[PDB]
UniProtKB/Swiss-Prot annotation, chain A:
Alphabetical list of NCBIfam families matching this protein: PRK04199.1-2, PRK04199.1-4
Keywords: Ribonucleoprotein, Ribosomal protein
Pfam families found in the cross-reference section: Ribosomal_L16 (PF00252)
Position of the signal peptide: none
Protein name: Large ribosomal subunit protein uL16
GO CC terms in record: ribonucleoprotein complex; ribosome
Keyword check for Transport: no
Keyword Ribosomal protein set for record: yes
Quaternary data: Part of the 50S ribosomal subunit.
Organism: Pyrococcus furiosus (strain ATCC 43587 / DSM 3638 / JCM 8422 / Vc1)
CDD domains reported in the protein's UniProt record: Ribosomal_L16_L10e
Cited PANTHER family: 60S RIBOSOMAL PROTEIN L10
Family affiliation: Belongs to the universal ribosomal protein uL16 family.
Curated annotation (Swiss-Prot), chain B:
UniProt protein name: Large ribosomal subunit protein eL21
Homology family: Belongs to the eukaryotic ribosomal protein eL21 family.
Gene3D superfamilies in UniProt: Ribosomal protein L21
Region (Disordered): 1-24
Keyword presence, Ribosomal protein: yes
Gene transcribed to yield this protein: rpl21e
Complexes and interactors: Part of the 50S ribosomal subunit.
Pfam families on file: Ribosomal_L21e
An annotated Gene Ontology molecular function: structural constituent of ribosome
Comp. bias intervals (Basic residues): 1-23
Species per Swiss-Prot/TrEMBL record: Pyrococcus furiosus (strain ATCC 43587 / DSM 3638 / JCM 8422 / Vc1)
GO cellular component: ribonucleoprotein complex; ribosome
Curated annotation (Swiss-Prot), chain C:
GO MF annotations in UniProt: rRNA binding; structural constituent of ribosome; tRNA binding
UniProtKB keywords: Ribonucleoprotein, Ribosomal protein, RNA-binding, rRNA-binding, tRNA-binding
Leader sequence residues: none
Family statement drawn from the similarity comment of this UniProt entry: Belongs to the universal ribosomal protein uL5 family.
Organism (species): Pyrococcus furiosus (strain ATCC 43587 / DSM 3638 / JCM 8422 / Vc1)
Name assigned to this protein: Large ribosomal subunit protein uL5
Assembly: Part of the 50S ribosomal subunit; contacts the 5S rRNA and probably tRNA. Forms a bridge to the 30S subunit in the 70S ribosome.
Keyword Ribosomal protein set for record: yes
Functional description taken from the UniProt entry: This is one of the proteins that bind and probably mediate the attachment of the 5S RNA into the large ribosomal subunit, where it forms part of the central protuberance. In the 70S ribosome it contacts protein S13 of the 30S subunit (bridge B1b), connecting the 2 subunits; this bridge is implicated in subunit movement. May contact the P site tRNA; the 5S rRNA and some of its associated proteins might help stabilize positioning of ribosome-bound tRNAs.
Highest taxon of source: Archaea
GO BP term, example: translation
UniProtKB/Swiss-Prot annotation, chain D:
Tagged with keyword Hydrolase: no
UniProt name for this protein: Large ribosomal subunit protein uL18
Signal peptide: none
Alphabetical keyword list: Ribonucleoprotein, Ribosomal protein, RNA-binding, rRNA-binding
SUPFAM superfamilies for this protein: Translational machinery components
Entry keyword DNA-binding: no
Protein's job: This is one of the proteins that bind and probably mediate the attachment of the 5S RNA into the large ribosomal subunit, where it forms part of the central protuberance.
Subunit structure: Part of the 50S ribosomal subunit. Contacts the 5S and 23S rRNAs.
RNA sequence: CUCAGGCGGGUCAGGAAUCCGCCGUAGAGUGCAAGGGCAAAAGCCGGCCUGACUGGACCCGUAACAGAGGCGGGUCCAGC
RNA sequence: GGUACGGCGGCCAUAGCGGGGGGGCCACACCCGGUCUCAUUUCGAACCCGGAAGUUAAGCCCCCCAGCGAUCCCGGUUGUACUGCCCUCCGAGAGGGGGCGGGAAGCCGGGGACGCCGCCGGCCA
C-alpha cells in the first residue's frame, strides 16, 4: 500500500468509466448502512471535509469498522443509524515499474477512491439525545482515519444547525 | 498519435442535431434565395448530405458571388487567402 | 357469468345505434409447425372450409428444438369479414358447445378460442386433409367509427370512450349467440 | 409527448394532410401547382404559388359551383364531375393568364384511371399545359359516364329495390340515371360556350 | 408498409413454433469499428433498370493560417 | 358583412399527451354496395369505383382544465458556482485573495400556457 499522500489531491481528471478502463478492481467496501435506518432519531451528526480530497476505500473501510464497533459496543444496534454517503468511483492507477522506467508510463489500476469537494458530508450518525457524546466520539474516531482536516456538525430533523445549542446544553 | 484531418473528424457535437429537431427541416431554408453580393452565415444542416461544405468552415460568414446549378458560390477569407465554396442554400442563413 | 351493467349497456346501445359493436373480422389459424404434405393438406382443408385462398405464414427466427428454419412456411392463416364471416362464425361457435369461458375475453372485448377436431358444421374425414384439423379462431370486434385509426389520410386516434371493453364484448356476444361460463 | 427528447411532428403531418417530402420535390420546380383533392361528395382544384409566409391560391374552382351556374345534378364525386371540374379550372387558369402548372395529388395514391387524373385530363383539354403521360388517363367511356348508366341498367333489370337504394337521390333530384352521358355532354357544351 | 421490447387472449403449443388486440420517439434496423444522420424513411417488403457510362470545366481536403506530386470529395455543361 | 364549413400553407410542443361539455343550412365524415377503374403475397381490412337508407357514437368544429411533458415572466437560494485582465496580497502545500469587467445550472414559491398567423373557396346575407 503506497502512501495516501499520492492520491490525496484532486488535480487529475476524473477516471471512472468502467466501460473503457481495463482491469479496474472490485470495491473493497461493500457495507454503507448500519444500525436501524428505519427508526427515527432526533439528532444527526455529520462529518465534513475542510478541503477537496480523495479518500481511499481502505480508509473508508477502516473508519467504518472502527465507528461501527464503537457504536455497537456503546449505543446498541437498534439505537443508532450509521451511514457513509460517498462511494469510491475514482480509479487509482500506478506506473508499472531489466525493467523500463518512464517508458510507456500510463498506470495500471491499483485501487479505488472517493473524490469529495469542500465542506461535503462524508458520513452521518443518527442518534437521540442520550447518545450524542457517543456519536461525536465516533465521528472524531472516523476523522482520525482520513487524510484531510474534518469537522463535525449536529442537525435536527428540520436540518438546522444546532451544534452549539446541543454542546452548550 | 498524429491524426490527419478528415471530413468528419471531431464532429460529434458540431454535426449533431437537437433531439426535438430530428427529421426534415422546414422547407423555407431549402427554398430560400440570395442575390450576388449578399452576406450569409454558414450553418450546416446535418441531415442533408448534398452540397455540404467542409465542417471547418461552419459558423463563418461569407459573401455570395454567383450561383451554379442549385448551389450558391460563397467566398470566404481564411487568413489572407480567398476560398470559394459551393454551398446548398439549406446550409446558408442570411445576415441580419 | 354475471354482468352487472347489462341493462345499462343495452340502453346505451339502443339510445346510440352507432355505439353498437360489430364484428371487425374472424381469423382462423392452423399452426401445423412443418412444411410439406401436411401443410398442403391443411391449406386444402382451409380452402374447402372457408372458400378463399389461405396464406402460408413462414417462421420468424430459427429454432432447432422445433426443427424450423427462417423463411420456411410453418402455419396457415385465413381472415374473413362480412356476412360470410357471420355465417362461418355461427358454424364455428356451434361446432363446440356454445359456451365461452369468462377468462378469454380480451381487454377490448375481442375473443380467441380453439377447435381441436372437425366436430363442426358439415365436414368429413376424407382421405386427403385428414388429421390436419385443429384451429384457433379469433373474433375481433369493433364500433362503426373505427375506420379513422385505420385509414391513411387524416388518421387520428380513438378515445377510450369509443373503444370497446370486455363487458361490452360479452354483452354483444350474448345478444348474438352463445353463453358464458364461470369456468 | 413523454419527455424532453420526444420529437413532435409538424402540425400538418400530425393532422395527416401534408406530405412534406413530396411537397419539397414539387416546390423545387418553381412552377405553379395544380392541387387536386377529393372528398366523399365533391372535388377541389386549385392553382397555387409558393410564398415563404404561406402559399397563395391564384385560381380556385370547387365542384359545388357546377350545381349552380351551368347546372349539374349528377353526383359530384365521380369521374364525369372530376372531368368537368378539370375543364373549369383549366379555363379559369387560361383566363387568368397562367399557362403552365404541375399536378399535385397530395396523399392520394397514383392509381391510373382515378378522379385526380380525370381532373388532369379535363385541364389538359381545357388548355392548361401540364406535363403528363396519356397512359394514366381514365377511359373515355368512364369519363363520359357509360359505366354508371350500365350499372343503372343492370340494377333495373335485376331487383328493382337494389336499383332504388343505389340511385335513390338521383330520382329525387329528378335526373334519370340513364342519359347521364347526355347530361354531361350538355353541361360540357355549356361550359365551353361560357368560356369560349 | 412500420421497427425492438412489453402486456392481455388463443388446439396440440410449453420460457421459446403460428395467429388476434393494445401500449410502443425508435429503446430496432441501416454489410463490417465508432461517431453523426435517418419513421407516410435513408429501415422492411415488391416492380422496372445499370448513372458503378462517355467528352470536359470549376472548387474544397490530405497539406487551417501557409508552399505540393499522387489521391479522395463537392458543384456543374454536353451526349446516350 | 356573418358562418360550432372546407382546401393550400408559415412558425414546428407556451402548439404535445390525457380529460369534461356542446354542434351539425352548407360543408367534412362515419356509413350502404362491389358491374365497371383499381388491389389483396387471403380478406372492398387498406386503396379504388359507384352512392345517400341511417348517425352525430367519433374524425372534425366551438368552449374549458394544469395530472404528465414543454416553456415564458417575477421573487429567494445569489451576485452563490464558475470566469477575463493586473498584482511586491495571504498560504508549507493544495490552493485562495484584492481591484475592474461578466455571470450560471438545479431546487423552492407565485403567475402563464390545452397554440398564433397568411392566401383562397363553399353557404347565407
Amino acid at each position: 500500500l503506497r502512501p495516501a499522500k499520492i492520491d490525496r489531491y484532486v488535480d487529475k481528471p476524473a477516471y471512472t468509466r468502467r466501460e473503457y478502463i481495463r482491469g479496474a478492481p472490485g470495491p473493497k467496501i461493500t457495507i454503507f448502512d448500519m444500525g436501524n435506518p428505519a427508526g427515527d432519531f432526533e439528532f444527526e451528526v455529520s462529518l465534513h471535509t475542510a478541503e477537496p480530497v480523495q479518500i481511499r476505500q481502505n480508509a473508508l473501510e477502516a473508519a467504518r469498522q472502527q465507528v461501527n464497533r464503537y457504536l455497537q459496543k456503546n449505543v446498541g444496534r437498534s439505537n443508532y443509524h450509521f451511514k457513509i454517503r460517498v462511494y469510491p468511483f475514482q480509479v487509482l492507477r500506478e506506473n508499472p515499474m531489466y525493467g523500463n522506467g518512464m517508458r510507456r508510463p500510463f498506470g495500471k489500476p491499483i485501487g479505488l477512491a472517493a473524490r469529495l469537494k469542500k465542506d461535503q458530508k462524508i458520513l452521518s450518525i443518527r442518534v437521540n439525545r442520550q447518545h450524542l457524546k457517543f456519536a461525536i466520539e465516533g465521528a472524531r474516531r472516523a476523522a482520525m482515519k482520513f487524510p484531510c482536516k474534518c469537522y463535525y456538525r449536529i442537525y435536527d430533523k428540520e436540518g438546522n444547525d444546532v451544534t452549539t445549542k446541543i454542546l452548550s446544553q | 498519435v498524429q491524426k490527419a484531418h478528415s471530413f468528419r473528424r471531431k464532429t460529434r457535437k458540431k454535426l449533431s442535431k437537437h433531439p426535438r429537431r430530428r427529421g426534415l427541416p422546414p422547407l423555407t431554408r431549402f427554398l430560400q434565395e440570395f442575390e450576388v453580393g449578399q452576406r450569409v452565415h454558414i450553418v450546416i444542416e446535418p441531415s442533408y448530405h448534398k452540397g455540404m461544405p467542409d465542417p471547418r468552415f461552419h459558423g463563418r460568414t461569407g459573401t455570395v458571388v454567383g450561383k451554379r446549378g442549385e448551389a450558391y458560390i460563397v467566398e470566404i477569407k481564411d487568413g489572407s487567402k480567398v476560398k470559394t465554396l459551393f454551398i446548398h442554400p439549406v446550409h446558408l442563413r442570411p445576415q441580419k | 357469468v354475471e354482468i352487472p351493467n347489462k341493462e345499462q349497456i343495452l340502453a346505451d346501445w339502443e339510445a346510440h345505434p352507432m355505439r353498437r359493436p360489430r364484428i371487425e373480422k374472424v381469423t382462423i389459424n392452423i399452426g401445423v409447425g412443418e412444411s410439406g404434405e401436411r401443410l398442403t393438406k391443411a391449406e386444402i382443408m382451409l380452402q374447402q372450409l372457408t372458400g378463399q385462398k389461405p396464406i402460408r405464414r413462414k417462421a420468424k427466427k430459427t429454432n432447432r428444438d422445433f426443427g424450423i428454419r427462417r423463411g420456411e412456411p410453418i402455419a396457415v392463416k385465413v381472415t374473413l369479414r362480412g356476412p360470410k364471416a357471420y355465417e362461418l362464425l355461427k358454424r364455428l361457435l356451434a361446432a363446440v358447445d356454445n359456451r365461452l369461458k369468462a377468462s378469454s375475453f380480451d381487454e377490448h372485448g375481442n375473443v380467441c378460442f380453439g377447435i381441436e377436431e372437425h366436430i363442426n358444421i358439415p365436414g368429413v374425414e376424407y382421405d386427403p386433409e385428414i388429421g390436419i384439423f385443429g384451429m384457433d379462431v379469433c373474433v375481433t370486434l369493433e364500433r362503426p367509427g373505427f375506420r379513422v385509426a385505420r385509414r391513411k389520410r387524416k388518421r387520428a386516434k380513438i378515445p377510450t370512450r369509443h373503444k370497446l371493453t370486455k363487458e361490452e364484448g360479452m354483452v354483444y356476444m350474448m345478444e348474438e349467440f352463445g353463453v358464458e361460463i364461470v369456468e | 409527448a413523454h419527455g424532453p427528447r420526444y420529437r413532435v411532428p409538424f402540425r400538418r403531418r400530425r393532422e395527416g394532410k401534408t406530405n412534406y417530402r413530396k411537397r419539397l420535390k414539387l416546390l423545387k420546380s418553381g412552377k405553379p401547382r395544380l392541387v387536386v383533392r377529393k372528398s366523399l361528395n365533391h372535388h377541389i382544384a386549385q392553382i397555387i404559388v409558393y410564398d415563404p409566409k404561406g402559399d397563395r391560391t391564384l385560381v380556385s374552382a370547387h365542384t359545388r359551383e357546377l350545381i349552380r351556374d351551368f347546372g349539374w345534378k349528377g353526383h359530384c364525386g365521380n369521374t364525369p364531375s372530376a372531368y368537368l371540374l378539370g375543364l373549369l379550372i383549366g379555363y379559369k387558369a387560361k383566363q387568368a393568364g397562367i399557362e403552365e402548372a404541375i399536378l399535385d395529388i397530395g396523399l392520394h395514391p397514383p392509381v391510373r384511371g382515378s378522379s385526380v387524373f380525370a381532373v388532369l385530363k379535363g385541364a389538359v383539354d381545357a388548355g392548361l399545359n401540364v406535363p403528363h403521360s396519356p397512359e394514366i388517363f381514365p377511359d373515355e367511356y368512364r369519363i363520359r359516364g357509360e359505366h354508371i348508366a350500365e350499372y343503372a341498367k343492370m340494377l333495373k333489370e335485376q331487383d328493382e329495390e337494389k336499383f332504388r337504394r343505389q340511385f335513390g337521390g338521383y330520382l329525387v333530384k329528378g335526373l334519370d340515371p340513364e342519359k347521364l352521358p347526355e347530361h354531361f355532354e350538355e353541361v360540357k357544351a355549356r361550359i365551353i360556350e361560357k368560356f369560349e
